């Protein structure tokens, strides 16, 4: 029987800073045990300082991104070129996703940008439209490997202040864009070692008030 879904592998990662936000993702596209492409981008600049990735089944991810990009375009037409806030885009994507509640987009969606106060924002979605704002979120095949590491290094979970008898937690603080990119790179090289669907390359999209910048890094090709 015809199965309309597939798994194109890959994994994505979105971290939010104080005055910036990053959305990273490997560039490997796969089916079963074969490699389709070593460089097939899946993190996109959608306009209005919003970056987006829909990881999972690539056909659904491409369609969703394509629809949201088009949603941004029509928001400008209908509302006097108003800028689409990250929170408004999130709610719009919920409606795009839930509109197919009974034939879902098989994707884990993450968007990143800046909120209306200029602070970094990351939103993650399930396949049918439940969403939540977060400081940190990994998605895709190797999310299980990466995410507990982020909890430990970004949000400082399980780390207590030395000498305090495990009474005083290690204090939360914003990381620099440089420290974040280190965690991203180390997250993806670790995932590349232990996950077969993760590798080839890593593309990071950084978002500041100045605009959207890209950064690319090689990964192991085995």
């Amino acid at each position: 029987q015809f199965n309309p879904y597939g798994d194109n592998g890959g994994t994505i990662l979105g971290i939010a800073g104080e005055d910036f936000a990053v959305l990273a993702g490997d560039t490997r596209n796969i089916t079963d045990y074969s490699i389709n492409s070593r460089y097939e981008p899946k993190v996109f600049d959608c306009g209005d300082n919003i970056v987006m990735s829909a990881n999972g089944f690539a056909a659904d991810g491409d369609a969703l991104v394509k629809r949201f990009k088009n949603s941004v375009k029509w928001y400008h037409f209908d509302h006097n070129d108003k800028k689409l806030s990250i929170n408004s885009a999130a709610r719009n994507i919920q409606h795009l996703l839930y509109g197919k509640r009974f034939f879902p987009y098989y994707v884990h969606t993450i968007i990143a940008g800046l909120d209306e106060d200029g602070k970094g924002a990351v939103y993650s979605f399930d396949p049918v439209g439940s969403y939540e704002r977060e400081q940190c979120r990994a998605g895709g095949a190797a999310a299980s490997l990466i995410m507990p590491f982020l909890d430990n290094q970004v949000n400082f979970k399980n780390q207590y202040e030395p000498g305090t008898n495990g009474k005083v937690k290690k204090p939360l603080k914003y990381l620099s864009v440089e420290e974040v990119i280190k965690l991203v790179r180390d997250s993806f090289t670790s995932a590349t070692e232990r996950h077969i669907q993760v590798g080839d390359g890593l593309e990071i999209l950084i978002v500041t008030k100045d605009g959207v910048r890209k950064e690319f890094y090689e990964l192991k090709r085995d």
Partner: protein, 212 residues
Amino acid sequence: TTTLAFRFQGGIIVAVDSRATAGNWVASQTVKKVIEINPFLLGTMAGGAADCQFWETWLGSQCRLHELREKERISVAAASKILSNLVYQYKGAGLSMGTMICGYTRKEGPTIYYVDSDGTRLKGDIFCVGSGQTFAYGVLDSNYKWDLSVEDALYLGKRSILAAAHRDAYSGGSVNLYHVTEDGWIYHGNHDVGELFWKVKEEEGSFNNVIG
């Protein structure tokens, strides 16, 4: 997932956990399971996240249109029924929802309705929904009184979620509290279960089975 809501002298207490799981994998510990429908109405999330988010947000839109047309606050009865009638239309299609619609009005007083994706709509004093509902019911049933103070009632809701968070694998993260009064709801913070457990263990003397 563990969500509870009960009526008492001072209104309604709503307490929920924060955990989301995809199999054994813990996807999130920071999930907002109380939906702020409007400043006067709350709704709990259990079953489908999207189904509860989407349709209880939609409910808030219908409630706003009602008070614009009728120039009067919508009743909890009417608000809950708009939601239950909607999901009944979709019956069979596969929606998944188990929620408590909570509010406090003049004509009704504090009111809670359990609404459910197979069309059920029940009015009641105490409701608990989720994988850890049974653990929470135990603490509630044995300690519940109508004449509870707001301080004590808030703690009871907090302690009941903690009981579930401890035993139920699919419940945990943090506890979110709400107090619903006639003038609207008041948020009573986010409480990490990790820190809360040890605190409660020491102060209360409970959980002797656990070494700390």
